[PDB]
Amino acid sequence: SSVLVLGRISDDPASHYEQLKPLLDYVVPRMREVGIRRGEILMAPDARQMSSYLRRGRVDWVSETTGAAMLLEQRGSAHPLLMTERGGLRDFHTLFFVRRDSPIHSLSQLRGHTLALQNASSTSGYLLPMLELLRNGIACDVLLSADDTPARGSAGYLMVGSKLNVAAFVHKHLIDVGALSNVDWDDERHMPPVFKRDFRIVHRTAPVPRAVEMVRTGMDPAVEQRLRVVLLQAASDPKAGPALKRFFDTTGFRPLDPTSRRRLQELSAGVQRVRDHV
Ligand SMILES: [Cl-]
Ligand SMILES: [Cl-]
């Protein structure tokens, strides 16, 4: 509370630390007038833990994709501060892809087949695709290992963790279908050209806002207000340039508005439905 703690859900804190510290170092001095003297970074392995941190006041501010964000809001532990633009894109969506030699051409043909997902905190790699399956009445049971098989009439999913693993398992004929964001598709660390050329997109979800800054329930309203002001000013401060590049290539922030609120509310309903029916 004299300290501002910035976090995110991370499966790779060694690497994500570097993404957060530069902007935290930019923010902290600019919050002195609301009692902030110092900054810390605290990441969490998953949404549940991060929700616990948030609820207990151990993390103040996270920058997350909107689905994860809604997991946090649903648990009562955080609320939106700013909508976040990353790599010049305000929105993203999930794509389902297969090997081009697969006999799958549509989402409906996932029945009988396996899907690679990421982890439960992933928007584009779990929440969105699972939501999509729910809307289309496509059952998708958790599979225990790559030797496990779906019931006939149903799909099944395997959690492979990383985005590269989704691409790799599908490429290597271990899993029939993969889910990634449309942005991930064009990001060569996640979707290597050597794999991508063997893939076909079979389905696209509707776009949602891509990312959002969340602050914890009970943050002091003056800290909240000033944080918002500081981030809003960052996008056009040259002294914030390198820090924002490191911060998931943040290219913009903007105030919440009735549209983004409505879109987060619809996404939140969808996430809740996924949560309720898994
Ligand atoms: Cl995501
Ligand atoms: Cl929006």
Side-chain angles (χ1 to χ4, degrees):
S1 198
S2 182
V3 186
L4 181 67
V5 190
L6 163 61
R8 62 165 286 188
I9 301 165
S10 170
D11 52 7
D12 186 15
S15 131
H16 297 295
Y17 184 87
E18 301 170 305
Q19 300 214 275
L20 300 173
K21 178 62 155 188
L23 181 62
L24 184 70
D25 292 353
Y26 176 91
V27 163
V28 166
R30 292 157 176 85
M31 306 266 299
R32 202 189 176 78
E33 87 260 64
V34 293
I36 298 300
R37 305 287 185 98
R38 60 193 65 86
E40 277 163 7
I41 299 298
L42 185 53
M43 287 170 279
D46 53 55
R48 282 210 269 168
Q49 194 60 67
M50 179 54 85
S51 169
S52 184
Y53 288 159
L54 285 165
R55 173 165 57 262
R56 292 183 280 127
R58 309 291 189 270
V59 168
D60 297 303
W61 160 36
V62 299
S63 186
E64 292 293 346
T65 64
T66 49
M70 297 300 96
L71 294 173
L72 304 171
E73 193 177 51
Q74 287 167 8
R75 297 177 165 94
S77 70
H79 56 277
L81 183 84
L82 287 171
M83 302 304 299
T84 308
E85 188 189 282
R86 293 179 181 172
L89 301 174
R90 289 196 183 169
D91 284 3
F92 72 167
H93 59 275
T94 288
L95 49 74
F96 289 76
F97 66 90
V98 301
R99 289 193 54 94
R100 141 156 296 298
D101 58 19
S102 172
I104 297 161
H105 290 83
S106 66
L107 196 74
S108 305
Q109 296 170 8
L110 256 69
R111 302 207 300 120
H113 289 102
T114 60
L115 172 68
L117 299 183
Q118 285 168 54
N119 54 62
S121 310
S122 168
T123 300
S124 64
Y126 179 77
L127 293 162
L128 299 186
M130 286 300 252
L131 179 57
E132 203 78 346
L133 294 179
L134 284 170
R135 287 156 166 187
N136 288 274
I138 293 172
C140 196
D141 301 305
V142 69
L143 303 175
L144 281 83
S145 69
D147 276 343
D148 192 10
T149 52
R152 62 196 79 233
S154 299
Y157 72 99
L158 290 158
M159 307 291 248
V160 306
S162 80
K163 295 172 185 192
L164 179 51
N165 282 359
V166 174
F169 276 71
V170 183
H171 191 253
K172 297 177 203 292
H173 293 91
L174 298 163
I175 299 181
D176 303 308
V177 187
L180 288 177
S181 77
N182 64 309
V183 183
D184 292 336
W185 187 247
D186 287 322
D187 188 328
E188 302 186 11
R189 280 159 312 152
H190 302 137
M191 170 69 51
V194 63
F195 303 160
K196 185 182 193 191
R197 70 199 192 191
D198 292 326
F199 294 156
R200 173 160 46 75
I201 299 157
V202 298
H203 185 84
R204 291 182 174 253
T205 71
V208 297
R210 172 141 199 204
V212 55
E213 305 308 303
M214 309 285 287
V215 293
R216 70 169 176 88
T217 301
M219 174 179 272
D220 166 36
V223 175
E224 177 168 340
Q225 167 182 75
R226 176 67 191 157
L227 188 53
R228 191 181 294 96
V229 173
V230 168
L231 287 174
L232 276 171
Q233 278 162 15
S236 72
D237 190 348
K239 298 228 185 73
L244 285 167
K245 169 49 75 78
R246 297 277 349 172
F247 198 69
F248 318 111
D249 191 26
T250 297
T251 48
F253 294 109
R254 80 193 182 273
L256 274 93
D257 66 39
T259 297
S260 51
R261 290 171 183 121
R262 285 180 286 262
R263 295 179 79 197
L264 290 178
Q265 193 291 305
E266 287 169 2
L267 170 59
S268 185
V271 166
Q272 184 62 251
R273 183 185 182 178
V274 170
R275 285 183 72 206
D276 287 346
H277 305 279
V278 163

